[PDB]
Enzyme design. Structure first.
Site, short mmCIF file in Angstrom:
data_model
loop_
_atom_site.label_atom_id
_atom_site.label_comp_id
_atom_site.label_asym_id
_atom_site.label_seq_id
_atom_site.Cartn_x
_atom_site.Cartn_y
_atom_site.Cartn_z
N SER A 20 -7.52 4.87 4.93
CA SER A 20 -8.02 5.35 3.64
C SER A 20 -9.44 5.93 3.73
CB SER A 20 -8.01 4.20 2.64
OG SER A 20 -6.73 3.60 2.53
N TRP A 46 -6.37 9.22 0.41
CA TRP A 46 -7.64 9.40 -0.28
C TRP A 46 -7.70 8.42 -1.46
CZ3 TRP A 46 -9.39 13.77 -4.08
CH2 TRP A 46 -10.73 13.51 -4.45
N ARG A 47 -8.61 7.45 -1.39
CA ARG A 47 -8.83 6.50 -2.49
C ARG A 47 -9.83 7.12 -3.46
NH1 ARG A 47 -7.84 0.94 -2.21
NH2 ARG A 47 -9.15 0.98 -4.10
N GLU A 85 -5.53 -2.81 -11.33
CA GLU A 85 -4.78 -3.26 -10.09
C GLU A 85 -5.65 -3.37 -8.82
OE1 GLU A 85 -0.84 -2.05 -9.60
OE2 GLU A 85 -0.47 -1.93 -11.76
N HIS A 142 0.29 -4.06 -7.69
CA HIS A 142 -0.67 -4.93 -6.98
C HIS A 142 -0.98 -6.13 -7.84
CE1 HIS A 142 -1.08 -0.74 -6.00
NE2 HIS A 142 -1.29 -1.12 -4.76
N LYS A 169 6.29 0.24 -3.46
CA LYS A 169 5.22 -0.48 -2.79
C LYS A 169 4.75 -1.68 -3.64
CE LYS A 169 0.28 -0.34 -1.63
NZ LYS A 169 -0.99 0.28 -2.01
N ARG A 212 1.34 -7.58 7.66
CA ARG A 212 0.91 -6.23 8.04
C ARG A 212 1.37 -5.88 9.46
NH1 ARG A 212 -2.78 -4.27 4.08
NH2 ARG A 212 -3.98 -5.87 2.94
CL LIG Z 1 -2.83 -1.50 -0.87
LI LIG Z 2 -4.37 0.21 -2.50
#
Ligand SMILES: [Cl-]
Ligand SMILES: [Li+]
Ligand SMILES: *C[C@H]1C[C@@](O)(C(=O)O)C[C@@H](O)[C@@H]1O
Ligand SMILES: [Cl-]
Ligand SMILES: [Cl-]
Lengths: 243, 251
Positions: A20, A46-47, A85, A142, A169, A212
């Site tokens: 990211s 891109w965050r 989130e 999330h 996700k 992960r």
């Molecule tokens: Cl995440």
């Molecule tokens: Li995230």
């Protein structure tokens, strides 16, 4: 059932590594993209919530263009993570959907992250807009406080599929080692019974690290690393792949 | 609570790496012992059931001595895996017990593996003998066909504690990825509720490989890797094992 972006096949083989970008402004994003040339990874996220001038659609698109032009051959994922989130700043629902639609129709991104809980009308409309412009949707959820039941998590992933996510996700916070196993159990149930497309799952924090690493086993198609360190992540994924 | 053998603290930190030595005869055992010196691992297991002169107690003890000679500072584990539990050859119960008692009183080895279901009286007698001669007992159980319920696995591990095992050990065969999660669940249930000493657990075969890597998270104190050939399905190259263990430990 796979998702292929710029020759990357998401949903088979080893899980794919996402890194990211988190810069505040154009110069910082350029510096990050430059530093990331020395790294090996599969998908660039891109965050956008880390960016300062998110008020201007022009500013956001200009940064997206810089990133696209810096790494023209990498799958590019546009993600505004809402504070709601676990993200870095608040945004109105209407401005969130303006930025996402603009990113979609600009041609600058291959994928967008769209939060399931944004609201049904907005989610459906944005999924349709993405698909109409040949952009894939990572539909996301999330919980940065706790881990829901496996039953609740599976239903959320199934709902994302029903709403047209290309890649469901979910990321959840363990409060115990047991909670990590609950996330792996949900992942496997999805994988083996309900999923008809790639799914990404993770248990956060130190306790959740194993989630992960073990995506090829339990059914998570991608994993996030830092430039866990990306080289160490790739080492473990390769060892598991070839075992 | 931990088990310390030649300065190695089993039950703390990173899971300890065990490799199995498997020579058919004295010359092969010699050669393997010399070659293993340069591999990096924490505990050497001699798989005695692979040795083809087990008929002679002298031959067995001479082979143990050759291994000890080559590796004076390594924790050394003597393991005859019975045919019943997946080993290479059938011998009588009395022969099995005699070999273990001779290993114990020789001073050549630090630990023996004793199978839980050998019989309770024989198990108790052999544990007592080990302890009388400062040898630790890895008490073991294997299911090479299937994975028992998490509750049955916990039952067995607890029985091993009740019979005085220094380190309970169970290895089970997954028929699905679900079975791997069952083994990890049993491991954690032991760590959090019942274990008062180190425990070793593994799910075998390719599907079970993650269980050989995640011991630090869920509570398995040791894990098996392969120097050149595996002693059970799912063991990976010992250097790759060590790499993953380190990454998980430091994450
Ligand atoms: Cl995440
Ligand atoms: Li995230
Ligand atoms: C304890 C037992 C464990 C193995 O079966 C395994 O790693 O799966 C290997 C054997 O050599 C050990 O005796
Ligand atoms: Cl707007
Ligand atoms: Cl569905």
């Amino acid at each position: 059932k796979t998702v292929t972006v710029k020759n990357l096949i998401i949903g088979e083989g080893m899980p794919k590594i996402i890194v990211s970008l988190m810069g505040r402004d154009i110069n910082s994003v350029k510096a990050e993209a430059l530093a990331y040339r020395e790294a090996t990874f599969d998908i660039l996220e891109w965050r956008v919530d880390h960016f300062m001038d998110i008020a201007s659609t022009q500013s956001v698109l200009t940064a997206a263009r810089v990133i696209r032009d810096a790494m023209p051959d990498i799958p590019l994922l546009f993600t505004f993570r809402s504070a709601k989130e676990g993200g870095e700043q608040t945004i109105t629902t209407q401005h969130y959907l303006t930025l996402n639609r603009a990113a979609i129709d600009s041609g600058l991104v291959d994928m967008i992250d769209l939060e399931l809980f944004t609201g049904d009308a907005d989610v459906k409309a944005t999924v349709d807009y993405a698909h109409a412009h040949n952009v894939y949707v990572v539909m996301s959820n999330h919980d940065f406080h706790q881990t829901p039941s496996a039953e609740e998590m599976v239903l959320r992933l199934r709902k994302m599929q029903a709403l047209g996510a290309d890649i469901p996700k979910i990321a959840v916070m363990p409060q115990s080692k047991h909670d990590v196993l609950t996330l792996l159990t949900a992942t496997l149930e999805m994988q083996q019974h309900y999923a008809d497309r790639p799914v990404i799952t993770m248990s956060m924090a130190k306790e959740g690290v194993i989630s992960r690493l073990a995506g090829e086993v339990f059914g998570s198609a991608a994993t996030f690393g830092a430039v866990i360190a990306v080289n160490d992540l790739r080492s473990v994924l390769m060892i598991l792949h070839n075992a």
